Amino acid sequence: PPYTVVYFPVRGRCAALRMLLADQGQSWKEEVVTVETWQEGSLKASCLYGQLPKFQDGDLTLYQSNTILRHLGRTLGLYGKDQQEAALVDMVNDGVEDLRCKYISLIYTNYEAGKDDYVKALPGQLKPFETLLSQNQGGKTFIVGDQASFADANLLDLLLIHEVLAPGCLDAFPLLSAYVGRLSARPKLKAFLASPEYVNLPINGNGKQ
């Protein structure tokens, strides 16, 4: 650190890393970039892949939401207790990323038309995580092992935004439901989740959710 998050005024792909920071009692700065400032071109051109989030950690500059998560993960000790757990953490995060991509596709590509089918296929998309939970201490702790990993933050966010998209989509998944309530109850995380810093930011940038 110091940590600096450069992003649009939305939760989007920074929601998980923000929860991770808050949960771990870390302090950071939010550098807000408006859509008008972005259309000016300057910043976009200076971005490695021409996109945000951009993350500053001391003299280190990173791009890619999952790179930021893994960086915080290996640097803060949220990346498994050993090499085997590390692989499982990755396997979870990759699964989360795959579904997040379909979700982002729905939101910005064809929300009105595709929402129904998307929701029909939703349970098959969530089942894997319920399964992973059931194979780890009956899903009583975290997604991998008995300690938090950056994959928890990313999975938790995925679940939270899908409950908004399709309320009760977790009722059919006992472990996932209990997992969400348990994590959301963690003091610092709970505080953050209830703060205007989170609540007053839309989930996505096109007003859809």
Q: Which residues bind its own copies (CB under 8 A)?
A: 48-50, 60, 62-64, 66-67, 70-71, 74-75, 83-84, 86-87, 90-91, 94-95, 98, 101, 124, 128, 131-132
What is the dihedral sign for C-alpha 74, 104, 187, 5? Answer: positive
Q: Interaction with ligand GSH in 39-68: which residues (CB under 6 A)?
A: 44, 50-53, 64-66
Ligand-binding site membership of 81 (annotated): no
CB atoms within 10 A of CB 5: 19
What string marks each residue from 68 to 107 as x (binds ligand GSH by CB under 6 A) or -? --------------------------x---x---------
Contact between 8 and 199 (Cβ < 8 Å)? no
**Alpha-carbon Rg for the chain in angstroms:** 17
For 113-137, give one letter per residue: b (16+ CB within 10 A) or e.
Answer: eeeeebeeebeebbeebbebbeebe
Instruction: List the beta bridge partners of residue 63.
Output: 54
Q: CB nearer to ligand GSH: give 98 or 171.
A: 98
Ligand-binding site membership of 70 (annotated): no
**Residue 120: what are its φ and ψ, rounded to 5°?**
-65, -45
Report d(CA 16, CA 18) in Å as an integer: 5
Largest CA distance in the chain: 51
User: What does 23 interact with, of ligand GSH, its own copies, none (CB < 5 to 8 A by kind)?
Assistant: none
What string marks each residue from 137 to 156 as x (binds ligand GSH by CB under 6 A) or -? --------------------
Q: CB nearer to its own copies: give 34 or 67.
A: 67
Report d(CA 140, CA 125) in Å as an integer: 21
Tell the smallest beta-carbon distance from residue 44 to ligand GSH (Å): 6
Ligand-binding site membership of 51 (annotated): yes
User: What does 13 interact with, of its own copies, ligand GSH, none (CB < 5 to 8 A by kind)?
Assistant: ligand GSH
Instruction: Indicate the annotated binding residues for glutathione.
Output: 7, 13, 38, 44, 51-52, 64-65
List of residues contacting ligand GSH (CB under 6 A): 12-13, 44, 50-53, 64-66, 94, 98
